[PDB]
């Protein structure tokens, strides 16, 4: 996991040490901006079927070569698995708005992503660019609050950053 609980209660154990006031201070920043963090979570829970479909053929507009046989998108059975694949990325980013850090991303959906995809001849360049479509796809005083998009947008360009 990955949160501020994974920082300070682990470092006090790594020092063999009490939860001193360095550790008690670090979780106060959760409290004053969990209200900032957790109206973003029900947006992509409310749009969990809305923006998966608008990101797939926005990716498949700029990656339209896949439909030949012998590639990653040779039939609709691939595309039926492909909207599963962006949503499984989209599940975890919703959960990282709850745990604070990128907890469910790294130990489940990020580490060893660069041992899988082109071995299964899946293009990694379409994977970041489907996400980079949704990275700029926001409008901060109109969709959500202004205190909600800066947790959302910093996780989506991280998904291009973590594949780097």
């Amino acid at each position: 996991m990955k949160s501020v609980i994974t920082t300070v209660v682990s470092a006090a154990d790594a020092a063999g040490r009490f939860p001193s006031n360095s550790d008690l201070e670090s979780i106060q920043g959760n409290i004053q901006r969990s209200a900032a963090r957790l109206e973003a979570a029900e947006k992509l829970a409310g749009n969990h079927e809305a923006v998966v479909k608008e990101a797939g053929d926005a990716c498949f507009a700029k990656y339209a070569y896949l439909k030949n046989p012998g590639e990653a998108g040779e039939n609709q059975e691939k595309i039926n698995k492909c909207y599963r694949d962006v949503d499984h990325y989209m599940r975890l980013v919703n959960y990282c708005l709850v745990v604070g850090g990128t907890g469910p991303l790294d130990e489940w959906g990020i580490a060893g992503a660069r041992e899988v995809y082109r071995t299964l001849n899946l293009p990694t360049s379409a994977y970041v660019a489907s996400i980079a479509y949704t990275r700029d796809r926001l409008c901060v005083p109109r969709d959500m609050s202004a205190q909600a998009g800066v947790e959302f947008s910093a996780y989506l360009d991280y998904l291009i950053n973590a594949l780097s």
Binding site: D136, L138, V140, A146, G149, V150, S153, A154, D157, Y158, I160, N161, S164
Partner: protein, 177 residues
Amino acid sequence: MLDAFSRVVVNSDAKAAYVGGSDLQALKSFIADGNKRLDAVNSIVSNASCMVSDAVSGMICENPGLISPGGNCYTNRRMAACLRDGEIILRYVSYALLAGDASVLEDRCLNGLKETYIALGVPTNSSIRAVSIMKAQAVAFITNTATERKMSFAAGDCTSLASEVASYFDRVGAAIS
């Protein structure tokens, strides 16, 4: 390691001084710019995988002497080891821009950084060119003067942080020249 809440105390311990309200207004200005520093450093790590890729492409754009065979930086392990060292300095300056203080810049890489490179045969004129690109894109992201990428902010002056990152890569660049 050390930060702006600890730089203010460490000189006062050389004179055994109680800290008062004669220097805390520098820190009251520092705790004023809490979210303002935080609205700077998120924009650095938003796109810094693009910043590593922009720098060492543009450093190769000015100089194809590395990519020539017999050069320092030309093959595929060598570029991956180049993309290693190209990230690790951007990782470190974001810590000091978080700290407001470049003590964490100094001890963790800059102790003998300069001439491990000529212990490896690494050209130091190419190093200061690449981090100058990383200087130049970093101020465009903590302002809103990128080409396409306009993050969401609230308006106001951020040049005091832009002078703080201006005092950072050159401290590396003087420690590698």
